[PDB]
Design a protein around this motif. Structure first.
Motif, PDB file in Angstrom:
ATOM      1  N   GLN A  61       0.852  -1.155   0.000  1.00 20.01           N
ATOM      2  CA  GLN A  61       0.000   0.000   0.000  1.00 20.01           C
ATOM      3  C   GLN A  61       0.888   1.204   0.000  1.00 20.01           C
ATOM      4  O   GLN A  61       1.937   1.280   0.629  1.00 20.01           O
ATOM      5  CB  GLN A  61      -0.895  -0.053   1.232  1.00 20.01           C
ATOM      6  N   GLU A  62       0.431   2.170  -0.771  1.00 19.20           N
ATOM      7  CA  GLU A  62       1.152   3.415  -0.919  1.00 19.20           C
ATOM      8  C   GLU A  62       0.097   4.516  -0.808  1.00 19.20           C
ATOM      9  O   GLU A  62      -0.872   4.536  -1.567  1.00 19.20           O
ATOM     10  CB  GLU A  62       1.800   3.333  -2.253  1.00 19.20           C
ATOM     11  N   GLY A  88       1.745  16.287   0.617  1.00 26.21           N
ATOM     12  CA  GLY A  88       2.760  16.101  -0.382  1.00 26.21           C
ATOM     13  C   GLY A  88       3.467  14.791  -0.100  1.00 26.21           C
ATOM     14  O   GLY A  88       4.015  14.182  -1.012  1.00 26.21           O
ATOM     15  N   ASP A  89       3.452  14.354   1.165  1.00 25.54           N
ATOM     16  CA  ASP A  89       4.058  13.112   1.611  1.00 25.54           C
ATOM     17  C   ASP A  89       3.573  11.802   1.027  1.00 25.54           C
ATOM     18  O   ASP A  89       2.374  11.577   0.862  1.00 25.54           O
ATOM     19  CB  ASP A  89       3.895  12.944   3.085  1.00 25.54           C
ATOM     20  N   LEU A  90       4.533  10.900   0.809  1.00 28.86           N
ATOM     21  CA  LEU A  90       4.214   9.584   0.288  1.00 28.86           C
ATOM     22  C   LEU A  90       4.625   8.658   1.407  1.00 28.86           C
ATOM     23  O   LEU A  90       5.740   8.718   1.913  1.00 28.86           O
ATOM     24  CB  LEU A  90       5.016   9.264  -0.947  1.00 28.86           C
ATOM     25  N   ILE A  91       3.681   7.823   1.818  1.00 29.83           N
ATOM     26  CA  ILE A  91       3.840   6.869   2.893  1.00 29.83           C
ATOM     27  C   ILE A  91       3.831   5.457   2.328  1.00 29.83           C
ATOM     28  O   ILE A  91       2.939   5.079   1.572  1.00 29.83           O
ATOM     29  CB  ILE A  91       2.689   7.142   3.896  1.00 29.83           C
ATOM     30  N   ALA A  92       4.847   4.664   2.686  1.00 31.16           N
ATOM     31  CA  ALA A  92       4.962   3.290   2.219  1.00 31.16           C
ATOM     32  C   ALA A  92       4.415   2.352   3.290  1.00 31.16           C
ATOM     33  O   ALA A  92       4.702   2.550   4.472  1.00 31.16           O
ATOM     34  CB  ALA A  92       6.427   2.957   1.949  1.00 31.16           C
ATOM     35  N   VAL A  93       3.586   1.356   2.940  1.00 32.87           N
ATOM     36  CA  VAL A  93       3.048   0.421   3.924  1.00 32.87           C
ATOM     37  C   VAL A  93       3.284  -1.025   3.428  1.00 32.87           C
ATOM     38  O   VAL A  93       2.451  -1.585   2.698  1.00 32.87           O
ATOM     39  CB  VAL A  93       1.509   0.658   4.169  1.00 32.87           C
ATOM     40  N   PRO A  94       4.389  -1.695   3.833  1.00 29.48           N
ATOM     41  CA  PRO A  94       4.730  -3.069   3.473  1.00 29.48           C
ATOM     42  C   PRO A  94       3.605  -4.025   3.821  1.00 29.48           C
ATOM     43  O   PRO A  94       2.935  -3.838   4.827  1.00 29.48           O
ATOM     44  CB  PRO A  94       5.992  -3.354   4.237  1.00 29.48           C
ATOM     45  N   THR A  95       3.411  -5.054   3.003  1.00 29.42           N
ATOM     46  CA  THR A  95       2.352  -6.046   3.164  1.00 29.42           C
ATOM     47  C   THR A  95       1.999  -6.469   4.580  1.00 29.42           C
ATOM     48  O   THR A  95       2.864  -6.849   5.358  1.00 29.42           O
ATOM     49  CB  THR A  95       2.756  -7.271   2.342  1.00 29.42           C
ATOM     50  N   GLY A  96       0.753  -6.307   4.994  1.00 33.67           N
ATOM     51  CA  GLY A  96       0.342  -6.720   6.336  1.00 33.67           C
ATOM     52  C   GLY A  96       0.780  -5.901   7.549  1.00 33.67           C
ATOM     53  O   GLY A  96       0.442  -6.275   8.668  1.00 33.67           O
ATOM     54  N   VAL A  97       1.602  -4.861   7.416  1.00 34.17           N
ATOM     55  CA  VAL A  97       2.011  -4.009   8.529  1.00 34.17           C
ATOM     56  C   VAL A  97       0.774  -3.244   9.026  1.00 34.17           C
ATOM     57  O   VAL A  97       0.106  -2.606   8.216  1.00 34.17           O
ATOM     58  CB  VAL A  97       3.111  -3.062   7.990  1.00 34.17           C
ATOM     59  N   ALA A  98       0.382  -3.298  10.304  1.00 33.70           N
ATOM     60  CA  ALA A  98      -0.784  -2.557  10.779  1.00 33.70           C
ATOM     61  C   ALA A  98      -0.411  -1.106  10.997  1.00 33.70           C
ATOM     62  O   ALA A  98       0.723  -0.852  11.394  1.00 33.70           O
ATOM     63  CB  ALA A  98      -1.275  -3.060  12.103  1.00 33.70           C
ATOM     64  N   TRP A 231      10.364  -2.480  -1.369  1.00 29.67           N
ATOM     65  CA  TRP A 231       9.591  -3.454  -0.622  1.00 29.67           C
ATOM     66  C   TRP A 231       8.195  -3.540  -1.213  1.00 29.67           C
ATOM     67  O   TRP A 231       7.553  -4.585  -1.253  1.00 29.67           O
ATOM     68  CB  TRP A 231       9.531  -3.015   0.853  1.00 29.67           C
ATOM     69  N   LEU A 232       7.755  -2.404  -1.730  1.00 28.61           N
ATOM     70  CA  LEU A 232       6.448  -2.319  -2.307  1.00 28.61           C
ATOM     71  C   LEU A 232       6.348  -2.620  -3.760  1.00 28.61           C
ATOM     72  O   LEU A 232       5.315  -3.117  -4.194  1.00 28.61           O
ATOM     73  CB  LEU A 232       5.894  -0.947  -2.133  1.00 28.61           C
ATOM     74  N   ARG A 233       7.413  -2.289  -4.491  1.00 25.32           N
ATOM     75  CA  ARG A 233       7.496  -2.442  -5.940  1.00 25.32           C
ATOM     76  C   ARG A 233       6.424  -1.487  -6.497  1.00 25.32           C
ATOM     77  O   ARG A 233       5.726  -1.775  -7.469  1.00 25.32           O
ATOM     78  CB  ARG A 233       7.219  -3.909  -6.318  1.00 25.32           C
ATOM     79  N   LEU A 234       6.245  -0.329  -5.831  1.00 23.60           N
ATOM     80  CA  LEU A 234       5.271   0.679  -6.213  1.00 23.60           C
ATOM     81  C   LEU A 234       5.906   2.036  -6.333  1.00 23.60           C
ATOM     82  O   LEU A 234       6.943   2.274  -5.726  1.00 23.60           O
ATOM     83  CB  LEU A 234       4.156   0.752  -5.195  1.00 23.60           C
ATOM     84  N   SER A 235       5.327   2.944  -7.124  1.00 21.63           N
ATOM     85  CA  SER A 235       5.914   4.256  -7.284  1.00 21.63           C
ATOM     86  C   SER A 235       4.850   5.334  -7.304  1.00 21.63           C
ATOM     87  O   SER A 235       3.660   5.044  -7.199  1.00 21.63           O
ATOM     88  CB  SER A 235       6.698   4.256  -8.576  1.00 21.63           C
ATOM     89  N   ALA A 236       5.287   6.586  -7.415  1.00 23.91           N
ATOM     90  CA  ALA A 236       4.392   7.720  -7.479  1.00 23.91           C
ATOM     91  C   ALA A 236       5.034   8.950  -8.080  1.00 23.91           C
ATOM     92  O   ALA A 236       6.180   9.288  -7.823  1.00 23.91           O
ATOM     93  CB  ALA A 236       3.900   8.101  -6.112  1.00 23.91           C
TER      94      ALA A 236
END
Lengths: 366, 366, 366
Positions: A61-62, A88-98, A231-236
């Motif tokens: 999740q991003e 403006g911030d981008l927050i990274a949320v690795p799989t399953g992290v609450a 970790w996410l393999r996601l971008s923005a």
């Protein structure tokens, strides 16, 4: 064939879930543009003193913060690290992290985000799901599938035993406001991998990757400068485009773009592998356009400015510009451009030199 | 279940597009062998002075030049670095990179290539689809789906603003001779990750991995000796076998294989998990035989020499040969081989030592 | 949606295959638990002087040894390396590697194992399928498809030529007792990546990860400890719990688990994203429960001891403890615990510290 689309439409949320101190908006993940893209979009707005209760997901999740200031805290496997955030911030949320989120000022935090349900880390199915630690509320994506928390599903005897507390407090843990609660007095919690930084501002920055004073600017957050993103393999991508400026036709060689317009409006054109113009319209505030992988996108702005966040699905995306300084036509031999486009040696020089700008192209001056 | 294959068949093309200066044949990707393999095979042929207009796909391509000489160019995200090819070359094209191909000799260049639609890099769907930078022509795989280029789908003012050109040359550029186009006089362009070698020769010319003077030879290009292949997660194998010789029964542990019979004819046998011989017959020139992941193959050369190109879907394919110097039975203790095959010690030795050759066995000697 | 599990049941095999010196049982891979998980469970028991004839599968396999001692040899692409094993040994079998197993004591070897058919290494389809090197008998998973070995499918002249032997020992090779035959005299072959160890102990004969003399123990084998597991992208967990002790509510952030009960019985509880308790019952010996990815699990031992093996589909599984010394709530600020559960400062403290134990909590003591 998920990605065999004839006509893309600018999508709106088809689900509003008003909570005590917030709102949750979700876009239908079963519409083919989202089935092709492999993500599930959401827009959580949290009013003053609101606290999004702890939740996790079965996919990367991003989160992008459209507006507001708050504190967001992760509970990675007294208390753990609390991160401050800004618009403006981008927050990274690795799989399953609450994680949890709290806003404290009047100006509501609006955070738009994507769950990459088609990740390799998503070992369940293509349904988005959210598992909340507390409260008796139906999770945002329950409507698409077709309540309680993960803790309320347990027998009292089990909770009493696991927490080692009496039945009475065990009852409160067992459920008995939706996802976004309002803290009466407000949290007095301190304003500042376990080492991994998961906050990188791409909106209200002053270091544009591309900056053109007559056209706009475009910033990107790849894993290069924001390494938690591997970790996410996601971008923005965050882009600000002046009225009538444009971002040249281009394509993402290795990624699926989910363009969400943050402000203003812009007229966009995406064409496919068959040359069909699958979308030729305008994208406005709070709306979304999904550009599949090698499909080509072009945008001309209609506002001062047209701001957007393009969530791409690859932490190191590669864009291939079809016009401008570093284009694919520019790196072509002046002779092959002549025989593929059927041009004179003079014309080929214009196609290869007339636009000196990279990515962003200034208004025609009319 | 896509790979639960009953009977295979040496497949020939179903589509053909005659282009001004060449031709394009494509094998039906919707065949169960191909759905199982997860690849799209096609064979382009560039006649003298033909140019192949720039294009790209959503997946790792791997081209093999059956015959010819010429120069090919890749437009990675005056002009870029061109590479010269000859027959027996293997060209690696990263996902999404655009490339053009030119032939100057009278001799037609024949190239057989696969597109790994089941790649991790392929974020769209299981459709093969090419994205042509220019021209008005229907993309090779449209047939399977059931126009123009990506540029001919855009608007004139979008194209004029993009390229910063007049409406006269933008209209040319806007798509206004198929994929392959003859350069009348012919190019004047020379004949000698940006620095990564993306061309390797596995032709008879190349030093082989296996060489038996009475059987043949086998040359394979993996990511160890050709490092760009670790990007495509693909690899290839050329093989020449003298008449009546044979390559022993063997299986690829980690890769599907797409055997393209270049020259001669053979008599192949591939058996599955149930012991069923799912193919008993002959794979002749210009035909394809798909041999899945753990399916065991064996072929007797019916010609001097049967030559093939096996496209493996793994950059480091591992093979498990059933008979040979290297074989599985060889590593088996003599006593355990006695017991799995109801044999005497002395017969067990015959199995582990009679045939002293690696992968290739000379003709039976009659 | 494959993982939209309504109700989980403690599954058991629906396929007995009695062989000469042993037995093979398998669980139906087409139930929603196993389709969701993406694995294929099986349980082979070999008795005295039994040999499991050489075979291989198209996926990562992980074999846990429930009971007995014997030897097992690998035939990686005189003879190859043979390893001895005992109870509690976790053997890592890399995709496509052929292996055989032997037992020489009265005590039968009971090896329960998993083939991850949802692996990146598996290029065929989701149907589990074993390929036998020798003997005519049908493959364990043929029942699920709807025989003989891979060698008994070739034409008698092809084996003849291949192994370079006569028609007679070619017939003995071409098939002409099942997969687990009895080695009459006994396999006298001495009791002791090529060098990469693929045997690691996690059973009761290990030095545990979590140990509590009042609750039990848990030993985890990840790629950190056993490096061959990073090849498999699989893991395992052995747990022994005293009567009435419990393992707290917890979820795997990145893995599916297949809990196979080795000894005893336990009252297990698993709940999903909608707070529904999808399983509230007893899991006893030889039965199995699939806890999909972010589903929460909590068990209470009804035996002395309830021992289980947990095949997780990720070589480095991360678990989220919901109650306990290191739990998710333990890391939450006392004030956000107060607001997400509707508790007071004091009660919040009781949830954070009443259970001083990590993962395993002792009997309640009444």
């Amino acid at each position: 064939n998920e990605c065999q689309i004839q006509k893309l439409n600018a999508l709106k949320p088809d689900n509003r879930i008003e909570s005590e101190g917030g709102l949750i908006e979700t876009w239908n993940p079963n519409n083919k543009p989202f089935q092709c893209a492999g993500v599930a979009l959401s827009r959580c707005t949290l009013n003053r003193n609101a606290l999004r209760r702890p939740s996790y997901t079965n996919g990367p999740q991003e989160i992008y913060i459209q507006q507001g200031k708050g504190i967001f805290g992760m509970i990675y496997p007294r208390h753990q690290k609390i991160y401050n955030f800004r618009e403006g911030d981008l927050i990274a949320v690795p799989t399953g992290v609450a994680w949890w989120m709290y806003n404290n000022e009047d100006t509501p935090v609006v955070a738009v985000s994507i769950i990459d349900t088609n990740s390799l880390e998503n070992q369940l199915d293509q349904m988005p799901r959210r598992f909340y630690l507390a409260g008796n509320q139906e999770q945002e994506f329950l409507k698409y599938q077709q309540g309680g928390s993960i803790l309320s599903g347990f027998t009292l005897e089990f909770l009493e035993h696991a927490f080692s507390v009496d039945k009475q407090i065990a009852k409160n843990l067992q459920g008995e406001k939706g996802a976004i609660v309002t803290v009466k007095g407000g949290l007095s919690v301190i304003k500042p991998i376990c080492t991994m930084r998961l906050r990188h501002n791409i909106g209200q920055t002053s270091s544009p990757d591309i900056y053109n004073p007559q056209a706009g600017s475009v910033t990107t957050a790849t894993s290069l400068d924001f390494p938690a993103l591997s970790w996410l393999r996601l971008s923005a991508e965050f882009g600000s485009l002046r009225k009538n400026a444009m971002f040249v036709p281009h394509y993402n060689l290795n990624a699926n773009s989910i363009i969400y317009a943050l402000n203003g409006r812009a007229l966009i054109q995406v064409v496919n592998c068959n040359g069909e113009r699958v979308f030729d319209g305008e994208l406005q505030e709070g709306r979304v356009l999904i550009v599949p992988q090698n499909f080509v996108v072009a945008a001309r702005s209609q506002s001062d400015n047209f701001e957007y966040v393009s969530f791409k699905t690859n932490d190191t995306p590669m864009i291939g510009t079809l016009a401008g300084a570093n284009s694919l036509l520019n790196a072509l031999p002046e002779e092959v451009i002549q025989h593929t486009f059927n041009l004179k040696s003079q014309q080929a020089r214009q196609i290869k030199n007339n636009n000196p700008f990279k990515f962003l192209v200034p208004p025609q001056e009319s």
